[PDB]
Amino acid sequence: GGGTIRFWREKLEGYKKYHQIVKTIKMVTLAKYRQTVVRTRVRDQTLRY
Amino acid sequence: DEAGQDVLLFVDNVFRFTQANSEVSALLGRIPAAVGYQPTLAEDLGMLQERITSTVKGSITSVQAVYVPADDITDPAPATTFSHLDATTVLSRSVAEAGIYPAVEPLECASRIMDPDAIDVNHY
Known part of the structure; x- marks a missing residue:
């Protein structure tokens, strides 16, 4: 199951990029x-009148 | 050697040659490697590869295909094949699913002759 670890690593790196983007x-x-x-x-002064 | 001509060598493909010995290594008594490959991988691969090399007498323009199972470049079989090459063209499933061919990823591949002295500076 060498694919599941790459899928989870890829999701992790995607979120890691998304973090600095939102930052x-x-x-x-x-x-x-x-x-x-x-x-x-x-x-709160320009419509006092 | 004898005829002195230039030669092409299209090979399709090296990975089947690797796994051919992998199916037998466990039966010979050889203990297998991490993923389930022979332990003699890099040696048999080099003893095959080193024969492929330009000489004073002639030249072999080889081209080799490889099977990357699961598109995992970390598979040791392609990985050991990097060192025995001059132009490591890499293809990817991603670029093909976008409907582009040849499905090349220019960043994950690179050549050896990409210098200003060997070729034109403008090309570099």
């Missing part, structure tokens, strides 16, 4: 969240 989405998200949180400190 890259995460860091790219925080790069724009840090940019956009500044609105929170300057929030």
Whole structure:
């Protein structure tokens, strides 16, 4: 059964790639969240009237 | 040697030659290897392969096929065959299922003559 181990290794390496992919989405998200949180400190004033 | 001509040698295929001795080795009394191959694999393979080599008198342009059972390159039978070759063309089930032929994986294969001195620089 030399195939089952290759199937499970391949699924493992696929998830290992998918991990760094989702980590890259995460860091790219925080790069724009840090940019956009500044609105929170300057929030809730433009429709006071 | 005698005629001095150039020669081609198409072999289909080496793996059957390997397993041919594998079916007998257990019966000879020879203890088998890990996967169930003979222990004399690399020696018999080399004593077959080394005869295939260019000489001063002539030249043998050999071509060899191999059976990779289960598409497992880690099978010791193809694995021992790497060293006795100059151009390790590799084919894969994946590329063929996409409807492409010749089902070559250019990354998992490579040649020996891929140098700038042996061939054109542009090709390199």
